[PDB]
Design a protein around this ligand. Structure first.
Ligand SMILES: Nc1nc2c(ncn2[C@@H]2O[C@H](COP(=O)(O)OP(=O)(O)O)[C@@H](O)[C@H]2O)c(=O)[nH]1
Ligand SMILES: Nc1nc2c(ncn2[C@@H]2O[C@H](COP(=O)(O)OP(=O)(O)O)[C@@H](O)[C@H]2O)c(=O)[nH]1
Ligand SMILES: Nc1nc2c(ncn2[C@@H]2O[C@H](COP(=O)(O)OP(=O)(O)O)[C@@H](O)[C@H]2O)c(=O)[nH]1
Ligand SMILES: [Cl-]
Ligand SMILES: [Cl-]
Ligand SMILES: [Cl-]
Lengths: 388, 388
């Protein structure tokens, strides 16, 4: 498992600003993220901005301290020292895990004088940084990662994920039965002869790690409630991980028929960014729909692991381009000539040609759907990329 | 009578969006937003203060062409600087351009939660009195706003007064000439005309401030979209402003002459998916250039105005409500007994009962549609509200 860094600090000290630096959809909207994959640094890691949970600290914030591999305590170096900061430092100092004191917004400053007050916190060396502009952030992260040192399974290895109370335990018990669940990290089992592995592990950190360890994620939704922010950030994390995905709309036994289309329409409207995944309507309690859930889990694994021959891809591309030409880039007419796979799990298709530098999102969506149909890629977040 | 516009100006990271959110904060928070997403706003209606006004956070442009325009066209500028940091060379160049302004320019020394020391450093900018504030916590903000507004001193038209709004280059000028030159149309900021006996007024490069002023002067807005491009962020924020104004709306999907038949459904799909929050308005698919489809615009403008101005008797509303609830009960089981109109242009329906504190967004959607069908309210952003 790769490390998780939890950002902690007073409101307005620069946490989300830092988080966006470390981890850097429809028009007019911006997707809320308070946890994601660290992209700044030589090693992979997860980042949690505990500002997204919230004076004393918050229940989930203290949990993040217990569960993260390290905490960054962010403070406003321009201000001076607020008494709220001294309280937080008192709890963090007890951490048996790393606590890095980051003195933020110290850009163009004197890094020694700006960390003068903060030795009193007894959390060690203050790290003068600037989350906005990046001064010292890369070097801070590299020291955090100097602690932790840095092949696809032949069958689907899946994690059941989702909000509390959607039915994950009921689904797992329905899948495994009593006898194989009493032998619980990885539980290998067989179904109709074919092999599967389920991963057993609210804890954001625990959910990210389930996603990291799996090659398929089964996202469980409670059909009896509206889709929630937390439903959406979990699914969003899975999407950023490129994890193959199957969606289990659970507690379907509760919905009357009149309400059924209203709920299917509601769910596709609010989880549009999952239209690459098959949606099953199941009842973990009454054990209905589980068989087709397994068909889709296997299909998601297959799609995720596909190896597509360049001539097939190029053939599919040229037929699509012949039927509908790409949008004219103002005056210039893009030419799409060939394409090949540049990644796996998820598959990535790289399109080659001239003037591919401003291809509209809708045309990229048309190529994606064509490729998905041609290669049966439902279940994996296939991505198109233009060689520019 | 035009309302004043205040433009926030300043370096990245001085507190503009924070201030803008404070100044435009709606207690009820009425935006039809999705789970996990947040709708971006950098201009809106001012809510802090005794008088009405608009606010623009010029940070949403990234000096810059549009920012310089806001300096020219706003009634006043707030120049936001970081009092904690000190005085950056970038701040001084901005002061050099702002100092030439023939309109009010207020120097706000932010993040002060030391007022005397922070006013001496900033007198070097020669922008007058520094105002020490804290946009995050609110220190001094209210007094700043009242001092800006102490300059500007503080009936529905019987027929539709409509404004054509939308992004640069979508066809607004072509559409206006087409409307005034149509077959059945007979002909200092308002242009009065008539069609088939009924009266109309249309309101007469691109300016965010001018778009906001068009909406406030109107009782109906015609939003023009360029069908030949993907819906853009700027398409959505213009529509979003119209929505926050509660402005009755007709949507003109323009340049339909360019779209081939195959591409046409892929485009209607794309538009309804990305402008979901406009599902209350009729969409027309027109060609302003070839002057096709303009005739049907006039009925929808009339229909939207009529809907916006409706007066619904309490017994009819309660009747429709009790019937809707009888056919589909709410999902402890809330009881909805009666309802009345508590607002106009847009109409607002207030529902009274027990256990109404957690009604799902999806049920409120069922009631909104039910009321919309029953009272012919397409074109006005009708909203349901619960008394707790
Ligand atoms: N009607 C219905 N209720 C269910 C179903 N699955 C779970 N529940 C109920 O949801 C509650 C929580 O289920 P649980 O498996 O613990 O959810 P978890 O938090 O995701 O593990 C329990 O009281 C279940 O009986 C289902 O398929 N249908
Ligand atoms: N000067 C400076 N300003 C910053 C920095 N990071 C964030 N800000 C500004 O701080 C304001 C709010 O900070 P935010 O990131 O939301 O703090 P959070 O509440 O901890 O997430 C924004 O207007 C930011 O642009 C920094 O490193 N330097
Ligand atoms: N093909 C096509 N082009 C149009 C149409 N309406 C406007 N245009 C073109 O769009 C460009 C800008 O139009 P204009 O009315 O100035 O857009 P505005 O910025 O919204 O006022 C011009 O070159 C027009 O010829 C239409 O219905 N079809
Ligand atoms: Cl991962
Ligand atoms: Cl293949
Ligand atoms: Cl205030």
């Amino acid at each position: 498992m790769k490390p998780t860094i939890a950002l902690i600090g007073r409101p307005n000290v620069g946490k989300s600003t830092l988080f966006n630096r470390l981890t850097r959809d429809l028009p007019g909207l911006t997707r809320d993220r308070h946890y994601g994959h660290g992209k700044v640094g030589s090693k992979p890691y997860f980042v949690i901005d505990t500002g997204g949970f919230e004076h004393e600290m918050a229940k989930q914030t203290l949990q993040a301290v217990d569960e993260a591999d390290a905490v960054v305590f962010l403070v406003d170096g321009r201000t001076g020292l607020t008494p709220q900061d001294k309280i937080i430092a008192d709890r963090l100092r007890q951490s048996p895990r790393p606590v890095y004191l980051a003195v933020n917004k110290g850009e163009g400053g004197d890094r020694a004088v700006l960390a003068a007050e903060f030795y009193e916190l007894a959390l060690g060396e203050p790290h003068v940084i600037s989350g906005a502009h990046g001064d010292g952030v890369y070097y801070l992260i590299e020291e955090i990662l100097e602690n932790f040192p840095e092949a696809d399974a032949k069958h689907p290895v899946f994690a059941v994920i989702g909000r509390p109370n959607v039915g994950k335990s009921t689904l797992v018990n329905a899948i495994l039965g009593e006898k194989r669940v009493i032998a619980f990290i990885h539980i290998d089992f067989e179904r109709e002869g074919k092999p599967f592995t389920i991963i057993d592990t609210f804890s954001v950190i625990k959910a990210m790690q389930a996603v990291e360890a799996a090659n398929v994620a089964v996202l469980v939704l409670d059909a009896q409630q509206d889709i929630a922010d937390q439903d959406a950030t979990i699914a969003g994390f899975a999407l950023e991980a490129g994890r193959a995905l199957v969606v289990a709309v659970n507690k379907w036994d509760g919905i009357s028929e009149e309400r059924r289309e209203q709920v299917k329409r509601d769910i596709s409207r609010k989880l549009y960014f999952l239209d690459f995944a098959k949606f099953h309507f199941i009842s973990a309690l009454k054990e209905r729909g589980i068989d087709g859930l397994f068909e889709s889990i296997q299909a998601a694994y297959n799609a995720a692991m596909i190896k597509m021959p360049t001539p097939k891809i190029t053939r599919v591309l040229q037929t699509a381009v012949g039927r509908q030409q790409p949008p004219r880039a103002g005056l210039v007419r893009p030419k799409m000539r060939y394409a090949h796979q540049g990644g796996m799990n998820p598959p990535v298709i790289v399109v080659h040609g001239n003037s591919l530098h401003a291809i509209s999102d809708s045309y990229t969506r048309y190529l994606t759907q064509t490729f998905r149909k041609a290669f049966n890629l439902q279940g994996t977040p296939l991505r198109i990329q233009y060689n520019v």
